[PDB]
Amino acid sequence: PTRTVAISDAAQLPHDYCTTPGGTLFSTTPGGTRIIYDRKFLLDR
């Protein structure tokens, strides 16, 4: 499954996330859910 999560603060920024060359954040949990992050905190992505 795909989950959309917005990040508007460093508090909301995960500590185990990954980032693709395009500059998109993502993380997958043990459950199998794939979370795609929209990093609004950082403007200079």
UniProtKB/Swiss-Prot annotation:
The modification Phosphothreonine is found at residues 20, 29. It comes from the Eukaryota. First phosphorylated at Thr-20 and Thr-29 by MTOR, inducing folding of region encompassing residues from Pro-1 to Arg-45 of into a four-stranded beta-domain that sequesters the helical YXXXXLPhi motif into a partly buried beta-strand, blocking accessibility to EIF4E. Deamidation promotes interaction with RPTOR, subsequent phosphorylation by mTORC1 and increased translation, leading to impair kinetics of excitatory synaptic transmission. Deamidation takes place during postnatal development, when the PI3K-Akt-mTOR signaling is reduced, suggesting it acts as a compensatory mechanism to promote translation despite attenuated PI3K-Akt-mTOR signaling in neuron development. A motif (YXXXXLphi motif) lies at residues 37-43. GO terms for biological process: insulin receptor signaling pathway; memory; modulation of chemical synaptic transmission; negative regulation of translational initiation; regulation of synaptic plasticity; social behavior; TOR signaling; translation. GO terms for cellular component: cytoplasm; intracellular membraneless organelle; neuronal ribonucleoprotein granule; nucleus; postsynapse. The TOS motif mediates interaction with RPTOR, leading to promote phosphorylation by mTORC1 complex. This is Eukaryotic translation initiation factor 4E-binding protein 2.
